[PDB]
């Protein structure tokens, strides 16, 4: 009939309004909330002491364990020993790390004899060509970004690194 409609047309609208205005005044404290989201790119996040970035190479810590291929997911680097006669261990001449084909496994970090394979954390890989990624011994160090050693950085700790509440 219509009397039921003449009674329920206000009920439908009053339910619509009780929901709409309620959600509106609830999200009111959201549209003008007091949270501050991620700042500019000069405010990178804090990094605790377990991650993986740019692996490092050495000449006095890779004793020629050579496990280099037996760790990376595709047996990535070369293996090269070239007829030494010092005692029995042929030298370390040919090698090339290439992060473009290493997928951050580098698991030898855990099984390497003397702390050779390690971790860092930067990323400014302005790759204009794939074939420009020969990471040899020492310039891998480069004394990297050093988030705390920069003069334009004040990084507050994130949720799981700041205090409680």
């Amino acid at each position: 009939p219509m009397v039921t409609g003449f009674m329920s047309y206000g009920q439908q609208t009053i339910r619509a309004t009780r929901y709409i205005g309620q959600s509106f005044i609830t999200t009111l404290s959201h549209t003008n909330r007091l949270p501050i989201t991620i700042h500019y790119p000069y405010e990178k996040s804090i990094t605790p002491e377990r991650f993986r970035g740019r692996i490092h190479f050495e000449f006095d810590k890779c004793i020629a364990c050579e496990v280099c291929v037996r760790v990376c997911p595709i047996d990535l680097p070369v293996v090269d020993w070239r007829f030494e006669k010092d005692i029995k261990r042929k030298q370390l001449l040919n090698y090339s790390i290439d992060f473009g084909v290493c997928i951050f496994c580098g698991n030898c970090v855990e099984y390497c004899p003397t702390s050779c394979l390690s971790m860092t954390e930067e990323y400014e890989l302005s790759t204009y060509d794939r074939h420009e990624l020969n990471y040899n011994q020492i310039a891998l160090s480069r004394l990297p970004i050093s988030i705390m050693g920069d003069y334009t950085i004040q990084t507050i700790r994130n949720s799981s690194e700041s205090k409680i509440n």
Binding site: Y128, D129, R130, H131
Partner: protein, 112 residues
């Protein structure tokens, strides 16, 4: 329909497009046209591409007996991706040399 292996510098189009615009993107697919590297990764002088045009008959008439499937399209593109590699490995052709990114799919030059 026009299901062609449109890989970089290898676009064996299974449909007639050799106007400025095919006017249907296929022109009923009755000619099987091909365009060579629109990105200008290699600069072409006619004589250099003449061997490729001649061996096109060797690839479309000498060794084709399978229906219009991309299987044959890979059968073509495989040798197409190495005819250029041979033509460059003997120095007859060279790279883009323009104001693009100048990428090296086969790496930088060598000293033989």
């Amino acid at each position: 329909q026009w299901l062609s292996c449109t890989t970089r510098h290898v676009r064996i189009y299974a449909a007639y497009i050799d106007p400025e615009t095919n006017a249907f993107d296929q022109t009923q697919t009755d000619k099987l046209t091909l365009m060579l590297d629109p990105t200008e990764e290699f600069v072409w002088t006619d004589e250099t591409c003449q061997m490729v045009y001649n061996e096109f008959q060797d690839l479309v008439d000498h060794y084709e007996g399978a229906p219009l499937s991309e299987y044959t399209l890979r059968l073509i593109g495989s040798d197409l991706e190495h005819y250029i590699r041979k033509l460059l490995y003997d120095g007859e052709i060279k790279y883009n040399m323009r104001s693009r990114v100048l990428n090296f799919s086969m790496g930088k030059p060598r000293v033989k």
